């Protein structure tokens, strides 16, 4: 197909349950049975009220931890309980949100050519990838991409991987979805692993699902933006700087302190890579998608490009709304900037603005790299 590979409609879905910032130092700290450790707690309720955080979804509610208490402590065995859970509910989100892309696009899923679902959680054969073709009754030929394990910045590496499916197809219709739980990472507090105190206090679960396709027919399709680049690239000797492994005890996870700096330190490079290409110098003119890692993560890129007061305005309603949601964090920031866009009557869904750039931070350290270009309004 000629044109470029466009997102053509986004649905997102999040459990339903939520959780007040406010409130989740009390209730963590209770269901994990670690109301004594009034040091930590304090230490964490200092954490959360930094986190810009106000709200999240969790699928974890005090009920499934008294059906498997074993989540609930810091060390003991829990993989097989967490796995019971998340090849369950992990699936069912994705549904959701891919229900609600799909009544968007307005297409019969008849049309639907291939499936991309990344997820952190719920390995198993078959994968959750089948899980959703049957729920969605998606057609059986429907081309799989299954990615377990990503994860926090799986958000461009589905699209970088949609925009060669749909490109290289004529009349391909990619759905996207990345559906991410925290069951698999939660575990009770210890000053034995201050990132986990991080993480329970930024992270939430959240999924994400969008329709690509080449050369939309615009008498029914209406593209948001079109995927012009996606590049990827290693940060040089930043392993162990994001880690996380499938254990007994569920999925261990740290963030090194010093990442804020080190993606500060190394997007100027992806960025210019990215942009000269277009001729493009000045970050002010191109909307801004980046994966809100936390706060100083932003703060930091903010610091770095010189950014004005508006740039991350989206991205940073999206993290206080939801919380960091791993791969579909970007996606959620899509949708916020196309509707908060046409909210205010803006040129292009992309802010106004013509160029736009994506980004995923995540283990490696590794940087996603993606050009859009937004649509007119």
């Known amino acids: 197909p000629h044109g470029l590979a466009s997102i053509l409609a986004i649905g997102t879905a999040n459990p339903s349950n939520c959780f007040n910032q406010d409130e989740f130092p009390d209730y963590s700290f209770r269901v994990t049975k670690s109301e004594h450790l009034t040091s930590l707690k304090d230490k964490f309720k ?57 009544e968007e696009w307005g297409q019969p899923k008849n049309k639907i050519t291939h499936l991309i679902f990344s997820s952190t959680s ?67 507090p210890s000053e034995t692993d201050l990132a986990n105190l991080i993480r329970m206090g930024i992270f ?54 010093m990442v804020p700096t080190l993606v500060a330190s190394n997007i100027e490079q992806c960025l210019d890579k990215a942009f000269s290409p277009l001729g493009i110098n000045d970050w002010n003119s191109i909307f801004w998608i980046p994966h809100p890692g936390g706060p100083a993560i932003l703060a930091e890129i903010e610091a770095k490009l010189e950014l004005k007061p508006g740039k991350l ?24 900037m196309r509707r908060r866009s046409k909210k205010e009557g803006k040129g292009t869904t992309g802010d106004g603005l013509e160029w736009g750039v994506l980004m995923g931070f995540g283990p490696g350290v590794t940087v996603e790299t993606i050009v859009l270009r937004a649509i007119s309004v």
């Open 46 to 102: 200092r954490i959360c009220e930094r986190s810009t955080v106000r709200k999240r979804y969790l699928h974890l509610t005090e009920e499934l931890l008294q059906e498997y208490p074993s989540i609930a402590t810091y060390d003991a065995p829990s993989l097989d309980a967490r796995q019971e859970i998340e090849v369950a509910e992990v699936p069912k989100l994705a549904a959701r949100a891919a229900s609600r892309a799909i």
């Open 204 to 257: 939430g679960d959240g999924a994400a699902a969008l329709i690509i396709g080449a050369d939309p027919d615009l008498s029914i399709e209406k593209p948001i933006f079109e995927i012009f680049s996606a590049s990827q690239t290693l940060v040089p000797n930043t392993s162990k700087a994001i880690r996380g492994r499938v254990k007994e005890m569920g999925l261990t996870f740290y963030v090194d302190k």
């Open 122 to 188: 719920g390995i198993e054969k078959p994968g959750v990838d089948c899980h959703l073709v049957h729920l969605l009754g998606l057609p059986l030929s429907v081309n799989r991409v299954m990615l377990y394990t990503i994860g926090c910045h799986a958000g461009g590496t589905v699209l970088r991987i949609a925009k060669d499916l749909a490109e290289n197809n004529v009349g391909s219709r990619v759905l996207v979805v990345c559906s991410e739980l925290t069951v698999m990472t939660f575990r009770g």
């Open 313 to 336: 305005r989206a991205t940073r309603h999206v993290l206080s709304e939801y919380g960091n949601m791993s791969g579909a964090t970007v996606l959620f920031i899509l949708d916020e």
